[PDB]
Amino acid sequence: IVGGESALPGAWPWQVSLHVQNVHVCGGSIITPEWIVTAAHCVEKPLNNPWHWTAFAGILRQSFMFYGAGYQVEKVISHPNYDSKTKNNDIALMKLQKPLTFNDLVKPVCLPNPGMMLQPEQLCWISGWGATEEKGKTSEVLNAAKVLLIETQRCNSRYVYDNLITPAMICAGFLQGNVDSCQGDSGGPLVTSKNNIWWLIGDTSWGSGCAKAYRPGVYGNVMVFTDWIYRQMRADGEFVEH
Amino acid sequence: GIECDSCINPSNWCDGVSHCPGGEDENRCVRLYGPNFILQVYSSQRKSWHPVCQDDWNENYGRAACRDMGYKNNFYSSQGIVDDSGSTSFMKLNTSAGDIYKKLYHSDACSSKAVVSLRCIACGVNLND
Ligand SMILES: *[C@@H]1O[C@H](CO)[C@@H](O)[C@H](O)[C@H]1NC(C)=O
Ligand SMILES: *C(=O)c1ccc(NC(=N)N)cc1
Ligand SMILES: [Ca+2]
């Protein structure tokens, strides 16, 4: 997160740090005690196998994510129509071996319902351990920042992303920059507060640089993916009934 | 016509019989609408989603609706509220029926004047308000 601030305990109880080889790779968002929403490009081969991934929840600091605090990932499911070249359908689901324990520091974010009626420039928040500046290293402390939704028409402009924003993507940030997600925030939450409920409206996907002018963050439109998300958990719920 | 994955007739979408090879026509028949979690069900005959009335709804019906949406045994709250979804047609419980989406029938009003608000999980809450 570039241009944001360090998160306090309980501020973003859904944010998880996904680890491979004892280091943070991507962010995720808890929706149920066993299901985390992340980005498909995080789990591209060779990280498509579940045994590579550990999820850390309720821990703000990377150096505090000790051996024994992590949750082993049991299943990884990339979106069936993911395109690694266009980042279209950049959504993936991770199932945990042991369900999370919910308290003030670990809680799920609500999946977006149809009829949200969000503002065209809705105030949003992005959190993650991503770089605090372009090409920087992972952030030790969890960071967060306010971003504004950017209408796809404007984001698809010729001086912004020139028709690269698909209906499976939403844009968030500031066309002047200085506040944006960055590498390491990918898969992390883009959430908004409405009706005193936090809604996961996007998952951090891609962008040209970090916090550069006229290059805002592009986020996977979770709203479009909810039908796929519901089908995956329901299908798992019936297999595991065995 | 509605597609399964890349085509059926919308009267055979959410009709209680699996017609798609992957069952896509019968697994996405229940949804929550709006920031107030209005419980809605898809009507095959009307090719539209409609709110569920609070009339004769209980916790166990919600847990069934929660299971059909993929939330398994997760259930948080279910109360009757005024319909803010601008809908004109609703779905009423049978009570003599014997599936949650096929246990409702079309109705142009609700006797309780309320629709089901269904929260399958306690989410969306941080340290602040
Ligand atoms: C409810 O289901 C029973 C079962 O046969 C049926 O006889 C009855 O007419 C149904 N009522 C409505 C209005 O759906
Ligand atoms: C993921 O690591 C990721 C997501 C998004 C960006 N770009 C911007 N938000 N500008 C970079 C990296
Ligand atoms: Ca059918």
Numbering used by the authors:
A (entry chain C): 256 to 497
B (entry chain A): 117 to 122, 126 to 217, 220 to 250
Reproduce text from the manuscript describing this model:
Host proteases, TMPRSS2 and CTSL/CTSB cleave the SARS-CoV-2 spike to play a crucial role in the two alternative pathways of viral entry and are characterized as promising pharmacological targets. The entry of SARS-CoV-2 depends on two distinctive pathways, cell surface entry and endosomal entry, where the transmembrane serine protease, TMPRSS2, and endosomal cysteine proteases cathepsin L/B (CTSL/CTSB) cleave the viral spike protein. The crystal structures of TMPRSS2 and CTSL/CTSB in complex with the potent inhibitors were determined to reveal their specific mode of interaction.
Nafamostat and camostat, two clinically available drugs used to treat pancreatitis, displayed excellent inhibitory potency with IC50 values of 0.40 nM and 9.00 nM, respectively. Initially, they bind to TMPRSS2, forming the Michaelis complex. The ester group in their common guanidinobenzoyl moiety then reacts with the catalytic serine of TMPRSS2 to form the acyl-enzyme intermediate and cleave off the “leaving group”. The guanidinobenzoyl group stays covalently linked to the catalytic serine and disables the protease activity. Our structures of TMPRSS2 in complex with nafamostat and camostat both capture the post-reaction state, leaving the identical remnant moiety in the catalytic site of the SP domain. Apart from the ester bond formed with γO of the catalytic serine, the guanidyl head of the guanidinobenzoyl moiety forms a salt bridge with Asp435, and is further anchored by hydrogen bonds with Ser436 and Gly464 in the S1 pocket. The crystal structures of TMPRSS2 in complex with nafamostat or camostat in our study, and a previously reported structure of TMPRSS2 in complex with nafamostat, demonstrate a high degree of similarity, with the r.m.s.d values ranging from 0.296 to 0.445 Å for all Cα atoms of their SP domains (residues 256–492). The values are low because only the same remnant moiety of guanidinobenzoyl group occupies the active site of TMPRSS2 after the reaction, although the complete structures of nafamostat and camostat are different.
